[PDB]
């Protein structure tokens, strides 16, 4: 397991968060190896999944499309991150896969699973058993949300992950059908003074509602795995949301369409950059081949940061500090990913999506960004008050900045930010349980 070594990805909002749990009588090492190998089939193409009846999430709607997965194990602190699900849905985890080895009844097991996790949408479990009896085999293969594989996860993992996607699409479609008749008010309006307003130390209703609904429709498509229609929805979302001057939601919409740009580039399809984004943000209509994609991404990112800044003086529609900081981390790691090659090629497109770090490499002359723009951008992270948010945000921010500086080759800066991490972890007013990665952290320092 890899706990305090976060390094986000710019396609993270497209990635699907899935919480994994050790049902039964497992050990730490065996479970860690199991989940690590299970986190190797997270590119389930939409071609190999069989279709679904409903149209707006049918896997038989686009020949390409990778349908990422993001397997994780940390139960993030709910009841405070619950509030900002209306603003964007991908924050909420959706599908549970539970590893089980006890030869126990799947029906009662998943019954108690659902009783424990009412909030989550798509539960399912997988048996890591060595030759379970035929009586259990009949019961499990009768039902869909229960599967079985031999220990070490090497029997039918591909088809299993195909089917998990198949149930997940149906479950998300049910969720959206239940969810498409809501007001979708901003998290500031939802919580009042429950989310910090990012204290720095540096005819107007129906159209807004329609724009927000079109946004969330496009965002659900983006998470579901059909992206050309997601782009076509994001265009008419942004153009309608610009005139109503709702800066906060427009920022996330612009972020989403930028993610669409990157991932369609990764899939290697042609697409014109729309006149609306070209008008709202300059480039300094036209095919992607006649423009350098990273500079486009950079100016888009800068403009959405500008809108998040411009959306602070409104008391109940202010962008939450968690979203602001996480987006900043996302752009910073994107810049570091770009700063490894003069050519913006399939290699780095694979790196950014698959999250392989490739520590240390030969520097080619004249990379995309210099090694001062990255540092100057990372200095923006300290401009916001950091020692007031809680430990998840603190550790994620300081750990990814440490990794950023390590890739840039600023060893003593990495030492500085790791020291900041250590004091921040010390100052928490709650007991913390031992992990074998604090060992690695102290050794590295």
């Amino acid at each position: 397991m890899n706990i305090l070594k976060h390094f986000p990805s710019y396609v993270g909002p497209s990635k699907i968060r899935t919480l994994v749990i050790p049902i039964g009588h497992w050990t730490r090492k065996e479970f860690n190896n199991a989940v690590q190998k299970l986190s190797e089939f997270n590119e389930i193409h939409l071609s190999d999944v069989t279709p679904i009846d409903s149209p707006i999430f049918t896997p038989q709607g686009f020949p390409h499309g990778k349908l990422f997965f993001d397997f994780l194990t940390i139960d993030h602190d709910d009841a405070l991150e619950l509030f900002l699900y209306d603003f964007e849905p991908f924050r909420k985890t959706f599908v549970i896969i539970g590893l089980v080895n006890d030869y126990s009844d799947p029906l009662t097991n998943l019954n108690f699973m659902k009783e424990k996790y009412p909030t989550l949408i798509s539960p399912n479990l997988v048996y890591a058993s060595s030759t379970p009896t035929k009586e259990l085999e009949q019961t499990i293969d009768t039902m869909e949300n229960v599967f079985a594989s031999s220990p070490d996860m090497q029997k039918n993992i591909e088809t299993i992950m195909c089917d998990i996607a198949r149930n997940f699409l149906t479950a998300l479609n049910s969720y959206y059908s239940s969810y498409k008749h809501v007001t979708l008010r901003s998290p500031g309006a939802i919580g009042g003074n429950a989310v910090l307003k990012t204290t720095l130390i540096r005819n107007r209703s129906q159209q807004k509602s329609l724009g927000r609904q079109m946004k969330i429709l496009g965002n659900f498509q983006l998470l579901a795995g059909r992206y050309v229609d997601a782009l076509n929805s994001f265009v008419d979302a942004i153009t309608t949301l610009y005139k109503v001057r709702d800066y906060l939601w427009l920022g996330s919409a612009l972020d989403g369409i930028s993610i669409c740009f990157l991932l369609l580039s990764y899939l290697g399809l042609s697409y014109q950059i729309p006149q609306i984004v070209s008008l709202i943000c300059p480039v300094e209509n036209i095919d992607v081949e006649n423009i350098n994609l990273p500079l486009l991404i950079k100016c888009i990112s800068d403009k959405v940061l500008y809108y998040y800044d411009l959306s602070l003086m409104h008391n109940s529609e202010y962008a939450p500090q968690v979203v602001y900081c996480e987006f900043l981390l996302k752009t910073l790691t994107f810049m570091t990913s770009c700063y490894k090659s003069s050519e913006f090629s399939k290699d780095v497109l694979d790196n950014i999506v698959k999250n392989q770090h490739r520590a240390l490499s030969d520097i080619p002359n004249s990379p995309m960004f210099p090694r001062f723009e990255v540092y100057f951008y990372s200095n923006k992270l300290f401009e916001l008050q950091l020692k007031e948010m809680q430990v998840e945000a603190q550790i994620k921010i300081y750990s990814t900045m440490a990794e950023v500086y390590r890739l840039l080759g600023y060893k003593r800066k990495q030492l500085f930010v790791l020291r900041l991490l250590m004091v921040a972890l010390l100052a928490t007013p709650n007991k913390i349980a031992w992990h074998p990665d604090y060992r690695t952290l102290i050794d590295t320092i």
Binding site: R412, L415, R419
Partner: protein, 146 residues
């Protein structure tokens, strides 16, 4: 206030000192006192990065790094000696650095380092343990720094 240091090629300090302004003579309150060496060690990396570049004078770097209201300025002499310091607010400001006062300050401090380097008993690794040097540096700080 201000906190000034002289550091050698092996990344160890041969001098450190801190200057108040007599309004809040405790200096940086209590936490920045602990944080000065680490922020300065952080800035050392950028100073080293600018140490070997093309682009006129290049001994004085000026404002190189930023932090919570701290302006970090640096000067490189010829042996890799780095004269680095951090300027802080008077408990509330947007502190700005002079363009010539600190230049001349580094000029004379480098003069002092040059003339105290010559004596045969002084090694590069050993610190500048000299009351005369300390007195001269602080009376220079009174005249130039503020």
């Amino acid at each position: 206030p201000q906190y000034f240091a002289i550091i050698g090629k092996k990344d160890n300090p041969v001098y450190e000192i801190e200057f108040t302004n007599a309004e809040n003579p405790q200096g940086f309150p209590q936490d920045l006192k602990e944080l000065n060496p680490f922020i300065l060690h952080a800035s050392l990396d950028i100073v080293e990065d600018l140490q070997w570049q093309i682009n006129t004078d290049n001994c004085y770097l000026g404002k190189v790094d930023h932090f919570y209201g701290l302006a970090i300025t640096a000067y490189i002499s010829y042996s890799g000696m780095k004269f680095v310091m951090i300027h802080g607010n008077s408990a509330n400001s947007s502190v700005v650095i002079d363009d010539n006062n600190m230049r001349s300050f580094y000029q004379e401090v480098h003069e002092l380092y040059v003339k105290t380097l010559m004596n045969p008993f002084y090694k590069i690794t050993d610190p500048i343990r000299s009351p005369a040097f300390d007195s001269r540096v602080r009376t220079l700080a009174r005249k130039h720094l503020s």
